[PDB]
Design a protein around this ligand. Structure first.
Ligand SMILES: [Mg+2]
Ligand SMILES: [Mg+2]
Ligand SMILES: [Mg+2]
Lengths: 434, 432
């Protein structure tokens, strides 16, 4: 009926690791989607199925996930009789076919790749651009261009430096449009390179996984100083603010936090959740920080709720909520945070991701659509953040094209929307208030 | 007629600089292409037109080039009534509309953006995959999957280290297929990170513009040691060899060469072209180096010919030849090199790039299709290298998706070709 052919293959992501790509065919043509991959993955994330074959890609192959698609998932959907516009029914069938909570039979990367391809096929079957099809799936009717959050300084578990905290972001909230926001982001990014070079030398101007610079610094306050200095020299103090992804789960040790966890282990330097919270308060006071992601461990609920109750800024749950309704519901009840980081590969399907988004928005939460540290040339989340009208997205620094592909696509979307294009601007936290 | 709309816009490349993207519409749909951008550009390259507005993208804007397409080029091609399959006529039309030798009026980035989009539109009009359309444009019958050249160690002008030479590449010539070559490249790349980290620390495992690691090293022989270490440790000593892009023009200092040109100037450390040649001889002797690109300055013709005459490996012209038939002809007669690095943005059009490729191949040269240090999500050169059957391509490390998009596309082309697919392997110099 609707689906003529589904064919999955093995491609390489932005880090050189294998990941899932899915080709879905209908009468209207070919629809291709790829699955991202995280590095600092939360323990409650849906299962990313790897082969474990040590003599092939060091055990990081995804032939098992690919086979699960080509052998089991593909014929099931083909013989289902469901139109590709039926996103929820097609996703539910894959959920039922898997039958496990964390998608541990087929793998979340196997299920998502199909779910993404189905969505694009459904859009064309609907004769709609992808972002508008997503809008209808979510029950939205008034699209919004998001404020981009550029990770210009990379730290954390997979960055070549001492910098403990993972991401230092800039948000051009005072930009005129999204295309203007892209300009402000790039100019500060290029300005930041000079600032870092002048102070630390050229060795500190190489980049990490997400395109942000990886300077040889330790103190996170210094990363904020550099970024702030770059904003000012670029001449955008009044238009650009700062966001952070701490990813505190990555340096959570023995009930405490280690802000020097890439140095030889020494428990004497560890700090408590209270001390860590007091450090954030200093950051918010001393710098234009308006958003902090994963300030505490994924299971340190008491620290989350206590800190959130004493700040006015955006508190983003990432590893805490893992785009999971069952986890979000708890966080809502406990007021652990006021914003959800939406990662489609954390939950495994488009339908579940949309449900997770609306569950957040219903409770007055902000929503930030996000990429993974390992991405592809796929640009799905660009149309996603527009269709869901969340008003904020982080998909990398203005560097490395697995990041720019999303940003460029968003510029195309704003162009396509014409005079009906709206930039979230200073209302990125609650874009519907626009 | 054929072309219904041509619309250009401003997008960002892999290093955050503006570049040209062109949307071309026919009855068969939308065909999109983007223009790459170089950093270590040769002085004889066709003009990359930048706005120069200091208050916008630090003067790197491409609004003028975009405007030249939308206001001038597009209505001229639409009024021509030429079919998109007529690649040569459409390219010639833009060349004549520009009317300048180095495409200084519209910019090479403006002309190429349309030329690339036209080519993709022509492929669909012919009901052919892009690589087959290109093959017929070049008059080729039997296709070839190229050996990938992964730039796994980054040095040079725009890398955050002391390393003078620009690119250190691995070539899985002993691979079973291109998909196998991708695995070999990635596995060595990941192994190399560990090798680098163990010796220099995690600070040295960050990447440069092309995805290769940027370790804090000075010696070029050390970069070769690290690479050779990774190959052996990965278990592919017999199957993976080494290529180099020296880009000597970047450290050419009025007759001599500075292998520490990112250090404070000291002319006493400068070496002659003869010394530099002797150094390459040492590299070829001690390491499996089978290809050297731009070993001398773009104008140091005597050094090129002298060195090429005394080596048996592949000598690749990049800034020397700039994908230009006029420069290629001179290099052929003077025997300056034996391989052409094919960059479409160096000459400005698909037609001229094909002419450049065929001219090199007619004279026994190898051809390596190449990307630029500043790339986009565009994957044209993947279809280009297969269609031109050159047998070798460098489009970055197996890191950063502006590189992987090409490599992934080449894996798709191999899968699509199936039985007809042949991997160049040890014949990467001569798949002919
Ligand atoms: Mg993470
Ligand atoms: Mg995070
Ligand atoms: Mg160059």
């Amino acid at each position: 009926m609707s689906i003529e052919k589904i064919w999955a293959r093995e491609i390489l992501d932005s880090r050189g690791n294998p990941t899932v790509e899915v080709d879905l065919y209908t009468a209207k043509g070919l629809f291709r989607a790829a699955v991202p991959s995280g590095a600092s993955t939360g323990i409650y994330e849906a299962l990313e199925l790897r082969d474990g074959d040590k003599q092939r890609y060091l055990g990081k192959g995804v032939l098992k996930a690919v086979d699960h698609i080509n052998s089991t998932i593909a014929p099931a959907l083909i013989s289902s009789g469901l139109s590709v516009v039926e996103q929820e029914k097609l996703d539910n069938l894959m959920l039922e076919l898997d039958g496990t909570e964390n998608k541990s039979k087929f793998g979340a990367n196997a299920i998502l790749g199909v779910s993404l391809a189905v969505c694009k096929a459904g859009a064309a079957e609907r004769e709609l651009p992808l972002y508008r099809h997503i809008a209808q799936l979510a029950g939205n009717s008034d699209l919004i261009l998001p404020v981009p959050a550029f990770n210009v300084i990379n730290g954390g578990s997979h960055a070549g430096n001492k910098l403990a905290m993972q991401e230092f972001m800039i948000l051009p909230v005072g930009a005129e449009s999204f295309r203007d926001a892209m300009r402000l982001g790039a100019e500060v990014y290029h300005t930041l390179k000079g600032v870092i070079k002048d102070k630390y030398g050229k060795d500190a101007t190489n980049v990490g996984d997400e395109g942000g610079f990886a300077p040889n610094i330790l103190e996170n306050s210094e990363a904020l100083e550099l970024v702030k200095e770059a904003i000012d020299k670029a001449g955008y103090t009044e238009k650009i603010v700062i966001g952070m992804d701490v990813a505190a789960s990555e340096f959570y040790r023995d009930g405490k936090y280690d802000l020097d966890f890439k140095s030889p282990t020494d428990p004497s330097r560890y700090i408590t959740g209270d001390q860590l919270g007091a450090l954030y308060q200093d950051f918010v006071r001393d710098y234009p920080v308006v958003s902090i992601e994963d300030p505490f461990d994924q299971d340190d609920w008491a620290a989350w709720s206590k800190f959130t109750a004493n700040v006015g800024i955006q508190i983003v749950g990432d590893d805490l909520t893992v785009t999971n309704p069952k986890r979000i519901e708890r966080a809502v009840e406990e007021k652990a945070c006021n914003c959800l980081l939406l990662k489609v590969n954390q939950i495994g399907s488009v339908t579940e991701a949309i449900q997770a988004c609306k569950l957040a928005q219903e409770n007055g939460w902000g929503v930030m659509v996000s990429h993974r540290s390992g991405e592809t040339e796929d640009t799905f989340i660009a149309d996603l953040v527009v269709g869901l009208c969340t008003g904020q997205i982080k998909t990398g620094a203005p560097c490395r094209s697995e990041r720019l592909a999303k940003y460029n696509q968003l510029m195309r979307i704003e162009e396509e929307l014409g005079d009906e294009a709206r930039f979230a601007g200073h209302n990125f936290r609650n874009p519907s208030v626009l």
